Structure 1
């Protein structure tokens, strides 16, 4: 086994953070000094090598805006140890008590961080395939990091998935760019489900017919125009994450220098 392995007694699971049919997520301590997130797999509910799939990708990716793998216990019972993100999922964050104070400058900076993490994914010729607010983690000082690479690979919820990927299995970094556009609407609506009042079948039907979500209330048209670029029918016409990162970093000087705060954004 490799250098990622740790002894089981160096890990202490303290507070349970979440649940599932396939495992648990705990806040804990590693080597008695390091605060960590610990992911477990429940015996014989899923294949051990299917559970380890996410860890294998995380071994190859290292970037300040991706959740970092720390250690692994690779024989059953399996544990996955990652950096601890104190504020939980971006989706929960946006929906909860802290949502009501976030304004456009915070939300756009969070989008810029996510674009930076995805620009690294882009540079590395990887695809994520499940980019959405539920798979972003939030830390102190509004730090946002991309997580859940369980489906990530080298070169599905229809509301976040590009049509060519959902229909024809065409997953590329450009279908992740599509998903990022949907993530931007989650950020600017404080975590609302996209395409409100539409079930999956209408969504499929409508998007192929040319329907796109309108500009969210109090969202500048220029930011909605960025969403529409991410949602171009032709995947090759969508911007790069490199472009998206630069656009969002410079947004309040180059694109909306006359922004003024409103009631919600």
Structure 2
């Protein structure tokens, strides 16, 4: 077994935070000292070989904007120990009591962090396939991180999916860029569902005819332009995450030097 393997008695599961058919998620303590998130896998749901393959991936990706794997109990029942993201999902963060205080400088810094995590995914030649606010985790001091997208995919959203991926199964880093554009609308609306009022079938129909969401209220046109680059019909014309990270990092000097705070953004 690996240097990642830990004894079962070194973990305390203190608070249950989430529940699905896959298993559960807990806040707990590791070795009596370390605050951790503990994801359990229900026995019998997944092939040990498949878990072994995904575990290898998890132990190879280290990035400050990717939630860090800490340890594993890799025999059934399986436990997965990661750094604890104390605010939960970005979706819940934006919808909850904090959303009303967030302004455009905070939201764009959050987007820059997520781009930085996806930039790393990009240069490691991986694909997320479900980039959206429900799958981003938030910690203290507005830190945002990309979660365990590989394990998520194995365990398993038309409105976040690029058309070539939704129709033809063409999932690439360029379809993650499209999703990142949708996530920009989540940030600027404080977590509203995209394409408000439209059902999935009409979203798909319209987007093929060239429909794109309009500029959200109080969002600068230059940020809506960036969204529209992410939603280019040709995937190869969409920008890289490396470009998205640099544009968002530099935004309030290079792009909107005259930004003034408003009622909501």
Give the secondary-structure state (helix, strand or coil) at the position aligned to 1:182: helix
How far apart are residue 150 of structure 1 and its match?
2.8
TM superposition shift of 1:52 = 5.7
Q: How many residues align?
A: 265
CA separation of 1:136/1:33 partners in 2, compared to 1, >3 Å: closer, same or farther?
Answer: same
Seen in structure 2, the aligned counterparts of structure 1 residues 233 and 156 have a Cα distance that, compared at 3 Å, is farther
Q: Is the 8 A contact 1:129 1:152 kept in 2?
A: no
Return the offset for 1:58: 1.4
Q: 2:24 touches 2:41 (CA, 8 Å); kept in 1?
A: yes
Q: CA deviation at 1:55?
A: 3.2
Q: Which moved more, 1:195-204 or 1:147-156?
A: 147-156
Question: Per-residue CA shift, 1:121-141, capped at 9, x if unaligned?
Answer: 111111111100011000011
Shift of 1:67: 0.3
Name the stretch that deviates more: 122-131 or 38-47. Answer: 38-47
SS of 2:35's partner is: strand
TM-score (norm 1): 0.96
Report the counterpart of residue 179 of structure 1 in structure 2.
179
Identify if the C-alpha distance between structure 1 residues 20 and 91 changes in structure 2 by more than 3 Å, giving closer, same or farther: same
Per the alignment, do residues 215 and 53 of structure 1 end up closer, same or farther by CA in structure 2, a change over 3 Å counting? farther
CA deviations 1:202-227 (Å, max 9, x no partner) are 11111000000000000000000000
Consecutive unaligned residues of structure 1, counting only runs of 5 or more, are: none
Q: CA offset at residue 51 of structure 1?
A: 5.3
* 1:174–1:235 CA contact under 8 A, matched in 2: yes
Q: Offset of 1:56 from its aligned partner? A: 3.3
Residues 16 and 25 in structure 1, CA contact (< 8 A), matched pair in contact too: yes
**Which stretch shifts more, 145-154 or 250-259?**
145-154
More off after superposition, 148-157 vs 54-63: 148-157
Equivalent residue number for residue 115 of structure 1: 115
Do the aligned partners of 2:22 and 2:155 also contact (CA within 8 Å) in 1? no
User: Alpha-carbon deviation of 1:48?
Assistant: 4.5
- CA drift of 1:154 comes to 14
Shift of 1:49: 4.6
- The alpha-carbon deviation at position 60 of structure 1 amounts to 1.5
Q: Indicate if the aligned counterparts of 1:156 and 1:166 stay in contact, CA closer than 8 A.
A: no
Residues 29-69 of structure 1 show CA distances to partners (whole Å, capped at 9, x for unaligned) of: 00111100000012234444555665332112110000000
**Runs of 5+ in structure 2 lacking a partner?**
none
Question: Does the 8 Å CA contact 2:181/2:231 hold for their aligned counterparts?
Answer: yes
Q: TM-score, normalised by structure 2?
A: 0.96
